[PDB]
Design a protein around this ligand. Structure first.
Ligand SMILES: [Ca+2]
Ligand SMILES: [Zn+2]
Ligand SMILES: [Zn+2]
Lengths: 425, 429
């Protein structure tokens, strides 16, 4: 029942199975293929910088330009095969870490099993539609022939800013510039993540005050939570809010989508007003009702697939009732349990389950940033324990990197090296 | 049912559970304590050089003795706390590797559960005897109190030769310089291993396709398992040093110098079993059977203990360990069919079979030539060596390319001379 994490080296030959060249979403017209690695079922990693739709000059901002930024920039990151391989091995280690405890095993099982519905707002209701970029992509086999493949998630390396992680869904555009967003409308879609495990920020908490570096596996799990919402089609960008009561730990800047607070979880859930929590709930319910209605009409497909097997799959995914005549509908109690299951995956709960220390809430201040040079070194960071090996688990000493930023900078200047973090320029 | 592998750093404080000070066997008179780390139930690691009974000049041999030897010497290995901690982390990684597959999980469960019999040839038959160095040792707790503790195995770092791993049992001497070796007589005893995971040798093999020879570095987890098989024999009291033999035909892959105990061939397993003569195989079987019959007889007499232990619980434990029959009157005896299965089980653990189960390449047999030796600088780096796969990560598993380090010593030496660095192995001086 727990998923299998596959291993590979960057230079391993294509094998038409776990290592293939693929045409990722939005590369349809340019027809560009990338070497990709199937880390687990339905999840592909492309260990290169994300560059699509991005002005290339942003990868190497000038010195005057750089200082203002919280972030960090280096155009040469992931420019060599050696480093792409290093990136891959780290990603393998973080997936093994997530898969080392039941709470993370369940999350990966969801990422694998919550496949997008074969259709959206602008496709035929009677048809399981497989042939557009929200549900499948072209792959180039070893013999050079092109075939189509379905998947749930594609992970890239970072864009210009090495400290920025982000998740997004895919748009279907049939003609006349129309745009369907099935990842926001209950159907779900293939999701995209830009992830950068070796560049991290730290947070502050009072025991005494001290800085703690973030565990990359928890950072990854945070992105996988956004992914999960996209796959279940509950993903949002709007519903933006600021807190009613500003606590001292908070750094409030602009209104922020309610999704960030639901994603952090714990006490941040209450920052989202009841009125919005009910809106979101009722929107998802209306969308699942629509999907049930449409599922009753499906009698053909755009591919050679087993229609009845996919119908069983969507019955389980959306927890639909199936009556004595084979008609699907939404059962309100099963829906309530499903909505709860989807929003049970949170940074707060996962940090607790993994015995990882994390920030006080989404609006907590980020410090740094830091480069983490030795995630692959088991004397520093393990699959089973992260940084908190042995007695370093006590008060999360394994994540403790110093009192504050200035104190850290002096030490690095004096030549005191840490093998855990390096403060970035 | 699979065991738990613990983690610790060398500098973690004593905690009366996984980290305590222990007074190891033979250190009783000097009363010397060492910081020790319980990697799994009943197994302690002392990540220091093994020095007991060893002439200190041997740690730093002169150019004359050193040049001839196939080994490698460095008096400074494990002299610092940082390097002791590194040694601990590698050992943690190797135990996690062993515990990653069923065949190795079963081995570690045996190491945990085959506790020594509480008695030996020179202790009273009516008594469970706990108070000597073959079954218990002093440990010093966080508050400084000294108590007695039982365990099965203590692992140290290497002695003088950093490439030599070795296993041994403990001797009891009640009086008059007498010596009991319960680990050879069916009882078992606390076992000792000197283990050095970072220094390794390679072996040769000819590919069936290329018809070309190549050297393969040994996986330290398989090297540790080989020593654990010797421990297992000692815990079951079947350990031998004699019964030494040479092969019938010296095959081209072999390098033979002296007779070798039959136990090395049984430990390797596979075709090496057939090197041990049938008459010796029957002698060993009948010796163990005779020793276990004596233990069944002695267990029927036990009515007291030298410590506050639960007597009936330990009787149940030895009933299971030795697979004794128990009749309706509570009388223990040897059942011949259960004995045959136990003996088979003990000797089921072999380097050959574990290598197959782990998809690790190993040498053609115990007498195979060793090459090198090599330093392995990056066992802790998961891009070089992993718990789940060892060196053979991803497509490196095909033809065990992950262990393939080159054509021969000559080519390797030349490449290293040219400045071509490997992150897998370094040829030693
Ligand atoms: Ca590891
Ligand atoms: Zn977020
Ligand atoms: Zn041996």
């Amino acid at each position: 029942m727990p998923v299998v994490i596959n291993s590979f080296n960057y230079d391993d030959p294509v094998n038409d199975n776990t290592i293939i060249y693929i045409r990722p979403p939005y590369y349809e017209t340019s027809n560009t293929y990338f070497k990709a690695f199937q880390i687990m079922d339905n999840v592909w990693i492309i260990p290169e910088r994300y560059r699509l739709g991005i002005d290339p000059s942003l990868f190497n901002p000038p010195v005057s330009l750089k200082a203002g930024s919280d972030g960090y920039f280096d155009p040469n990151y992931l420019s060599t095969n050696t480093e792409k391989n290093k990136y891959l091995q780290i990603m393998i280690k973080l997936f093994k870490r997530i898969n080392s405890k039941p709470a993370g095993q369940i999350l990966l099982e969801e990422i694998k099993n919550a496949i997008p519905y074969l259709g959206n707002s602008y496709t035929q209701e009677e048809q399981f539609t497989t042939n557009n970029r929200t549900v499948s992509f072209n792959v180039k086999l070893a013999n050079g022939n092109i075939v189509q493949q379905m998947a749930n998630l594609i992970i890239w390396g970072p864009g210009p800013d090495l400290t920025t992680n982000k998740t997004g869904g895919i748009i279907y555009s049939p003609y006349q510039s129309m745009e369907a967003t099935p990842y926001k409308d209950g159907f779900g879609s293939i999701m995209t993540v830009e992830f950068s495990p070796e560049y991290a920020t730290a947070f502050n908490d009072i025991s005494s005050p001290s800085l703690f570096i973030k565990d990359p596996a928890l950072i990854l799990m945070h992105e996988l939570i956004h992914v999960l919402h996209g796959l279940y089609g509950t993903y949002i960008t709007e519903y933006k809010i600021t807190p009613n009561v500003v606590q001292s730990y908070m750094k409030v800047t602009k209104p922020i989508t309610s999704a960030e607070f639901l994603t952090f979880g714990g006490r941040d859930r209450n920052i989202v007003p009841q009125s919005i929590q009910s809106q979101l709930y009722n929107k998802v319910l209306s969308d699942y009702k629509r999907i049930a209605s449409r599922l009753n009409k499906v009698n053909t497909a755009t591919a050679l697939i087993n229609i009845d097997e996919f119908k069983n799959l969507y019955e389980w995914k959306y927890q639909f009732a199936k009556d004595s005549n084979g008609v699907y509908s939404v059962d309100l109690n099963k829906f309530e349990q499903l909505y709860k299951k989807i929003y049970s995956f949170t940074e707060f709960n996962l940090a607790y389950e993994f015995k990882i220390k994390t920030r006080l809430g989404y609006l907590a201040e980020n410090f740094g940033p830091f480069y983490l040079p030795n995630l692959l070194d088991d004397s520093i960071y393990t699959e089973v324990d992260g940084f908190n090996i042995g007695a370093l688990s006590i008060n999360y000493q394994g994540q403790n990197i110093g009192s504050d930023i200035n104190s850290i900078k002096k030490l690095q200047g004096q030549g005191v090296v840490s093998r855990v973090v390096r403060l970035c320029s």
